Design an enzyme around this catalytic site. Structure first.
Site, short mmCIF file in Angstrom:
data_model
loop_
_atom_site.label_atom_id
_atom_site.label_comp_id
_atom_site.label_asym_id
_atom_site.label_seq_id
_atom_site.Cartn_x
_atom_site.Cartn_y
_atom_site.Cartn_z
N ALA B 236 35.85 46.47 40.47
CA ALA B 236 36.03 45.25 39.68
C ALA B 236 34.68 44.62 39.31
CB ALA B 236 36.83 44.21 40.47
N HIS B 237 34.76 43.58 38.48
CA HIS B 237 33.55 42.87 38.07
C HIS B 237 32.77 42.36 39.26
CE1 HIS B 237 36.13 38.94 37.18
NE2 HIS B 237 36.35 39.43 38.40
N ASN B 238 31.45 42.51 39.16
CA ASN B 238 30.48 41.95 40.08
C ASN B 238 30.54 42.56 41.47
OD1 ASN B 238 31.14 39.50 37.98
ND2 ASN B 238 28.99 39.79 38.45
#
Ligand SMILES: CC1(C)CC(=O)c2c(nc3nn(-c4ccccc4)c(O)c3c2-c2cccs2)C1
Ligand SMILES: CC1(C)CC(=O)c2c(nc3nn(-c4ccccc4)c(O)c3c2-c2cccs2)C1
Ligand SMILES: Cc1ccc2c(c1)-c1c(cnn1CC(=O)Nc1ccc3c(c1)OCCO3)CO2
Ligand SMILES: [Mg+2]
Ligand SMILES: [Mg+2]
EC number: 2.3.1.191
Lengths: 337, 335, 339
Positions: B236-238
């Site tokens: 996922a993001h980050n």
């Protein structure tokens, strides 16, 4: 393509009660059927509802016949008849027709008779496509791979090199067959790639869902038996062997060198450990955590299902502390005894 | 093909037998024929080395007395196998030269000896380093940079502003840089948060097939050097993954997770976000990771398979474990 | 792209404290922001840190204002204002512009105004693309499918035949909409394919992540309501119906004929069995194993979390043998009850 009801009944080996000249144009659900449609009844609770169905004909059993309010096709097995008539009347298009001018086909590829290849597909050197094979738009078929007669790939399927696919298979979009298995040796904490020089062999009449990945073997092959059906987003690791007629439902993750026997049924979202065997005639229910070999046929399950969050918090904390609960039970047993 | 003595030298292995044997390829012990080199790790195969038909077998010193063919003696047969399979690799390249049906923006910046397969699409501003190979049907989005020696198989999607290091390998169907799952809420209605961070992938990263790695919301999703990620994974993001970590198939990681170096995440695990896993952690298969991990070692979860008749009773009793606990506490009070 | 701070503040309905002539070029995080950037603060623990942020402006609340060390935009909801200003200053490119010469488009396809179709995309017969639709490079859009105005597909999206997509949708790469559902009959031990001749109907303002699969129905349709958000690696089986505004996080698997209501929140990696219904306003936490219908709103959970391996081995063994623990407890109760 439209068909007279009497002719459809003959192709289905059904007994016609009603007008053989009725023209059938397609299949529909009982609730959506309109004039021209044929439908089917499997649940006799719907007998009293048949007057609400607007189909031109209904497939049913002999016991249902007195309740018909339409032409009826009487069969022993309405569900199987439905599957057959839906194939006769199938509206699904082919993934391609003829050879698209935008397809890129190596001069050494061997094309059988009546092969179709969709726009922007890419066929590598040495590929062999059997008679009646259809390759959808945007596919890639890698070097020396062979696809047997009558097999079809939907759009945007990726087949790597040296893959063998049998006859009359169907592969849905986004699927990848033959990527490198997850093979690495560890040198002092760094991963060293092991080239994956085995293959994938897929048998005859295999159906593979969308965005499924089937990796090639490390040395010997990943093997999918005849008649296997695999749903969407499954992972079939290197050197997995799946026996004939097994069904694998959506999102199953299998680790490397798992052997699954014939005639198994693996429920959606299961997780299966590698370097082990599941014997023939095993059913794993959905979300099964298969850590150990399965050596006897039958039905197997795992998992603690949903509860209200307030209840779950207590369930999970007490399970996590079950060793203390066990010790306390033994201590009380000793005190009482 | 290669002479056994030359192969033994390249592998820093000790040759016992005819250095003039010609080795043409690697095979498993059961499949090996004349011309093949194979290897053994497990001592159970010693007894039937006389049934193996390889021209040579990689093995240890303790194995040598059981050899029935030319032998290469090393300390670590499995690692030596990796190296000899690289020397003898038959895998083709995703592309050779630039295909006439590839669609390449005139502002792409291409190094030397770049190969781009048929119908691949390269956007404006993309930089491909020396010896980069882009398979057929790939998309590489605006201003992305792919370092020297990196290779994408067919039908890989790289979004815009992605950075990939040197000597990486990405298998087909993978998507790097799609939007993270970022939404505000304006009275029950989701409001999209544009995801304007990036993905930064280091050097020597290998990513499997149909894996997704989302771009960050403002700052970046980061994959460290030497990381290996199997198929069907979601990053996922980050998320930040430390160097040399391995992630097996079907793992799902939530936003803003940080994983350390030298970790081993087993297949189909679920790792929650906004937390950290320290270096040298192993999570076994299907692990349900809800809390930070602050000490190295092996961690596990899950109640494994039982026959269905047994499972029905196990699950019913577990679901009612609060009542069992209350009854135990009542019995203690009474006694 | 760039915008004066006073103009940005007006568009955000924010109160400006500072120089409205500041030129804002983009949004950044507090840690990364430099001159020209606007950022935001939602956590007041960062008040003492504001002197380290080099943004040209910071969105904050009235309670944060005395702590500012920059031009400030004061709002009630910094997070929502962040989402709006990130849309205003978005740097995300479009999947395509204009119609690419390498796209292959059937003569019977119908295009609205200002459609863009990317390189090597393939558009089948009968397709209708609405005004302002963007189709990314390498996509496939199958026969007779309809994509409503303003909807956008990223590169390498596959839409099968007879699919309907509403307006202002966004689909990320690798996603497959309309593949056959997993439908087979049994003829004396042989699987018989059931053609899947239903469709997928996707509403307006739906966002679908990457490598998600949404299968077509067997006879009737798979339905995704308006305003639904679906993350990556999700599997939506044939004949699933999802109600408006529901959110589905990454890696969720939904089996055939599930019906999910409106305003639900399905946590990542959950497994939802089929032929059942989940009512409106249900939250399933991550990895939830849903075996039964949910008839009341609220939050529901499952799963036993991680422990050190040696501890887990004992937990699992004791749980697997819990029937014996139950029998022992019952026997002890009878003794304590003098029976
Ligand atoms: C092959 C068939 C015609 C009959 C069948 O066996 C089957 C079918 N569809 C399934 N969907 N899911 C599923 C999918 C996603 C999440 C949870 C569950 C199953 O587990 C399914 C199974 C099986 C049940 C037990 C072992 S296999 C269709
Ligand atoms: C839609 C939103 C703006 C808010 C939201 O509710 C949500 C969001 N992202 C998530 N990621 N994961 C996740 C992903 C992978 C592995 C484990 C967990 C969730 O479970 C997420 C949830 C939910 C939590 C409970 C029900 S939905 C972003
Ligand atoms: C798939 C499966 C299913 C059920 C399982 C297990 C595995 C399992 C359990 C306990 N051990 N194992 C084996 C395991 O997880 N090995 C492992 C761990 C980390 C890794 C790795 C392998 O590959 C390299 C990347 O990191 C509990 O039940
Ligand atoms: Mg082309
Ligand atoms: Mg999963």
């Amino acid at each position: 393509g439209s068909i007279r009801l009497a002719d459809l009944a003959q192709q289905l080996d059904a007994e016609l009660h009603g007008d053989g000249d009725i023209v059938i144009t397609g299949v529909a659900s009982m609730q959506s059927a309109q004039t021209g449609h044929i439908t089917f009844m499997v649940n006799p609770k719907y007998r009293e509802h048949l007057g609400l169905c607007q189909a031109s004909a209904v497939v049913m059993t002999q016991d249902d016949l007195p309740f018909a309010k339409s032409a009826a096709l009487v069969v022993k097995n309405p569900y199987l008849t439905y599957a057959r008539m839906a194939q006769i009347l199938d509206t699904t298009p082919q993934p391609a027709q003829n050879i698209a001018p935008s397809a890129v086909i190596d001069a050494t590829a061997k094309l059988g008779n009546n092969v179709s290849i969709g726009a922007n597909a890419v066929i590598e050197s040495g590929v062999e496509l059997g008679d009646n094979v259809i390759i959808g738009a945007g596919c890639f078929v890698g070097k020396n791979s062979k696809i047997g007669a009558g097999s079809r790939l939907w759009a945007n399927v990726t087949i790597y090199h040296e893959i063998q696919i049998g006859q009359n298979c169907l592969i849905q979009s986004g699927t990848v067959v033959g990527a490198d298995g997850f093979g690495y040796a560890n040198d002092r904490g760094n991963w060293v790639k092991i080239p994956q020089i085995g293959r994938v062999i897929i048998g005859d009449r295999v159906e593979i869902g969308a965005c499924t990945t089937i990796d090639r073997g490390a040395l010997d092959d990943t093997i999918i038996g005849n008649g296997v059906i695999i749903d969407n987003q499954c992972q079939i690791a290197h050197n997995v062997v799946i026996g004939d007629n097994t069904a694998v439902a959506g999102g199953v993750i299998m680790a490397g060198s798992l052997k699954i026997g014939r005639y198994c049924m693996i429920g959606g979202a299961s997780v299966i450990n590698g370097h082990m065997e599941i014997c023939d005639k095993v059913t794993v229910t959905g979300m099964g955590m298969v850590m150990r070999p399965i050596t006897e046929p039958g039905v197997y399950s795992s998992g603690i299902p949903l509860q209200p969050n307030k209840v779950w918090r207590k369930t999970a904390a007490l399970v996590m502390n079950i060793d203390d609960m066990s010790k306390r039970l033994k201590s009380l047993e000793r005190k009482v005894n």
